[PDB]
Amino acid sequence: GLDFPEYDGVDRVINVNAKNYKNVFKKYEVLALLYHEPPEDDKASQRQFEMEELILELAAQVLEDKGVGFGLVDSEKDAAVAKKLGLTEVDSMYVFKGDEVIEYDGEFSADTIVEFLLDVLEDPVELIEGERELQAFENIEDEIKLIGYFKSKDSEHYKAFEDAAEEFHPYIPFFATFDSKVAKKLTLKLNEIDFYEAFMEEPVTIPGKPNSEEEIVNFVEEHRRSTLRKLKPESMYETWEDDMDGIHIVAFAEEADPDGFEFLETLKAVAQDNTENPDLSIIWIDPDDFPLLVPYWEKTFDIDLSAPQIGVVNVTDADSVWMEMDDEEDLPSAEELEDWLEDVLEG
């Protein structure tokens, strides 16, 4: 209360080993384990890990009362514990809530770790009982949204829905309603599951009742990638891996600046036209959400980010081309984007 919140220097991150990993597991609600190889002998690698340890130490302090634990499993000194716990990807964070395990693959900053783990602490299903709560659903525009209308929470169909909610927690939100009155506002019947793709006004309905736990999974697996995706720090690396033939379409637009405000809606219209093109993965990167990568992007691509930008980035060749633009000239329309997209299939 009165104590101002600062990093107190108290070590909290647990050196997991074969003796305590059980006690540690049965101790915290959610346990975050960083599976790391031993840092090299040199002073620089020691400092890279020195920061990783601290970034976790700051998160361990923030989520102490919230029942979130942090541990470091050494790929060699704790090789046994990692084998049993199913720890494969070295230099990566695994998150354990109940039985489902999460291979965290976002940015490793104390900000993003905590927000992600806070979103892990809540329930997978987020119920709606009011219009003020139903208005929030209608505002979701930046990621994959899912809605399921059930008669009751105790019903068996909704019991397989929460089980199908844990497999994607918390990267894509799963909502559920038990009101028939809102079921008509969403064109959703009883046990009818609607699917909202990211940045898509008109949704896509899923097969009628019944829907098994295995059923709900396989549809998202086919539609996890939206035509347009916002780059989020909690998953910026899994998103960047998911490209089309080593080719990403990337849009630099600040959601706040008016130049970018129309640039996002000009962009979202392009994906509305070519959503029948599964080979089209375009990624919107809010520069206000990645302030540490701004000077590196401006230098790698020779651009100014104060002005919105768009181009094609080759992941395989590590090459990029960027639409030259004039700030005084009018912001190019969606026709000028696909006309410039004609120079994408030329090579």
By beta-carbon proximity to Ca ion, the closer residue of 78 and 234 is 78
Contact status: 17 vs Ca ion (CB under 5 A) = yes
- Report the residue from 98, 132, 202, 222 that binds a copy of itself according to the rule CB under 8 A: 132
The answer to whether 46 contacts a copy of itself (rule: CB under 8 A) is yes
316 belongs to the binding site for a copy of itself (CB under 8 A): no
Applying CB under 8 A, which of residues 133, 179, 215, 238 lies at the interface with a copy of itself? 133
Q: Which partner, Ca ion, a copy of itself, none, binds residue 46 by CB below 5 to 8 Å per kind?
A: a copy of itself
Strand 68-74 and strand 30-36: pairing?
parallel
Residue 6 lies near a copy of itself (rule: CB under 8 A): yes
> Which partner in Ca ion, a copy of itself, none is near 207 (CB below 5 to 8 A by kind)?
none
User: Taking CB within 5 to 8 Å according to partner kind, which of Ca ion, a copy of itself, none is near residue 221?
Assistant: none
DSSP state of 347: -
On whether the CB atoms of residues 180 and 208 are closer than 8 A, the answer is: no
Return the percent helix, strand and coil in the chain, to nearest 5: 35, 20, 45
CB atoms under 10 Å from CB of 290, counted, come to: 16
Q: Which of 100, 179, 215, 257: binder of a copy of itself (CB under 8 A)?
A: 257
Of 136-144, 186-194, 267-275, 337-345, the segment contacting a copy of itself by CB under 8 A is 136-144
- The alpha-carbon radius of gyration of the chain (Å, integer) is 23
User: For residues 158 and 176, is the Cβ–Cβ distance under 8 A?
Assistant: yes
Report what 347 binds from Ca ion, a copy of itself, none; CB cut-off 5-8 Å by kind.
none
Please confirm whether the linkage preceding 258 is cis (ω < 30° from 0): no
Given the rule CB under 8 A, which of 40-48, 182-190, 195-203, 263-271 is the region that contacts a copy of itself?
40-48
Residue number with CB closer to a copy of itself (65 or 222):
65
Query: What stretches of the chain show up as alpha helix (H) in DSSP?
Result: 21-25, 43-62, 79-84, 110-121, 131-137, 156-166, 180-183, 213-223, 236-241, 258-273, 294-301, 334-341
Closest CA to 241 of 88, 95, 105, 104: 105
Candidates 18, 127, 190, 256; binder of a copy of itself (CB under 8 A) is: 256
Task: With CA atoms as reference, report the closest residue to 191 among 156, 145, 157.
Answer: 157
CA 330 to centroid of chain Cα atoms? 33
Work out how close the CB of 111 gets to a copy of itself at its nearest, in angstroms, rounded to a whole number. 5
In contact, 78 and 70? CB cutoff 8 Å: no
Between 189 and 224, name the residue whose CB sits nearer to Ca ion.
224
The contact set with a copy of itself (CB under 8 A) reads: 1-2, 5-11, 43-48, 50-51, 54, 57-58, 62-63, 65-66, 109-111, 114-115, 118, 129-130, 132-133, 135-136, 138-139, 256-259, 291-296, 299-300, 318, 327-328, 331
